[PDB]
């Protein structure tokens, strides 16, 4: 609120070091890395909570001594005069990004379609490389280590290596998952074969013992008898009830005992 | 085909039943109890091992 | 639409309910027993086939 | 898939048309079993599909 | 992946042996660059692997 | 489009020099390398881009 | 089939007037609107019938 009065509001974003501790930040200012991301303030929302500020990466800075604030934009972009192969790594980088997002979708593809290498609209290739590496799931420590790099080839290689590390972890997880699913399918398919055999052999073997070994056996047992109509209809009703009921129920067992 | 499929399958719960069958073997089993035991064995084979009815059936057989 | 290929459910049970409805048809059923039987049939419909209370209700209906 | 006995019996044939006929008949012999197995498998599969579709209709009613 | 200027300079050569020598030298240099990058990457991967296997076990834990 | 009516459709593929510049291509013509490769067009596809032409080198020339 | 041998394949398009009549198209040439639209034939398919012209508006004329 103190900076709203200012004509050009601004906000700075930094990165904490390992072993985060809220009390340490206020107690000592040395917890934050010398690297910082100075950027402008867009707008406050405060929908759920009272602090939902928007931050963006516009101007990187490396304070000489945070304790002692002097600053300068020593944004070094050393590059080779001959530019005929330098972008060759960019093609493989975009191909790797495409492979990662296809195999490991994380965000919408519309951003990639809007920014295409062939369009030539990319006036800041370094920022594009940073955005591409942003999709990397590496820890903030890896990001800080990459930032420590000053040579363009070294930083590009480290971003590519982090992409490859994420690729390796993701593909290992996917391979494990698909192997587990295929094991499930094999185990269930052998059981389906067993059920097919059971259906085929129920008549051949057990003669439908689940219900029929009782039904037909008692039918034949009564066949030799000159069965009165009363007990005949009673037996028919009892057999219908037995067929309706499941084989492993107490009511079914009592019905079977009465029928016997 | 039936016998080839039978030979292609290696799983069964028979051994426990055969235990009681051999227990009966040495005994000079009267026919009445033999047929009653066969009927109850068929029921046991029909029933799942974990059902309480199966437990009562197993106790009766023992 | 409730009736979508389902039989003997959400309607008169063929085994018992509908079976005894035709039995009641010929009789000159008094209103008292009419309502008592209607309530009993509703309870039978609300009860599962294999329950003891269902069996008692069916026997009373018989 | 003809057994080695069938292969030896075919080899015993001397006339070219006879051996060609026997080879075609062995192919038909294996094809009959393959067709029977395929038809039985798809029949059981469709039976399972219908048994599950009726349950799906019941679930839709619920 | 040599530079397009390298391709044009190879095209400049007229005699077959000279262009063959230039192509072989270009292949040698490109393979040496790839070999250097691969060796540096192997060293970096080894250094990253110095991270204790406890870290991978804790990754699985998390 | 203008070469569809032409009896023999063809195309010449070239290579530029360093410092690529779209404006200089139309402003000056010496940027394109003297060496070229004439070939016969195969077919237009234009899946999503209005120009997706297929280029193959057949007849080299300087 | 007569324009396949023509050195310059092109197909025209016009518009009709009110009270369309198929017989009047061949009996009189004045039924068609004077405006015309010449264009180039793209491809012949003849999937369902023997005539599946693909036409476009390329060169208008009066």
Curated annotation (Swiss-Prot), chain A:
The gene is LONP1. It comes from Homo sapiens (Human). ATP-dependent serine protease that mediates the selective degradation of misfolded, unassembled or oxidatively damaged polypeptides as well as certain short-lived regulatory proteins in the mitochondrial matrix. Endogenous substrates include mitochondrial steroidogenic acute regulatory (StAR) protein, DELE1, helicase Twinkle (TWNK) and the large ribosomal subunit protein MRPL32/bL32m. MRPL32/bL32m is protected from degradation by LONP1 when it is bound to a nucleic acid (RNA), but TWNK is not. May also have a chaperone function in the assembly of inner membrane protein complexes. This is Lon protease homolog, mitochondrial. The Lon N-terminal domains are crucial for the overall structure of the protein, maintaining it in a conformation allowing its proper functioning. It is linked to CODAS syndrome: A rare syndrome characterized by the combination of cerebral, ocular, dental, auricular, and skeletal features. These include developmental delay, craniofacial anomalies, cataracts, ptosis, median nasal groove, delayed tooth eruption, hearing loss, short stature, delayed epiphyseal ossification, metaphyseal hip dysplasia, and vertebral coronal clefts. Disulfide bonds: none annotated. Belongs to the peptidase S16 family. Residues 1-167 form the Lon N-terminal domain. It is found in: Mitochondrion matrix. It comes from the Eukaryota. Duodenum, heart, lung and liver, but not thymus. Homohexamer. Organized in a ring with a central cavity. The ATP-binding and proteolytic domains (AP-domain) form a hexameric chamber, while the N-terminal domain is arranged as a trimer of dimers. DNA and RNA binding is stimulated by substrate and inhibited by ATP binding. Interacts with TWNK and mitochondrial DNA polymerase subunit POLG.
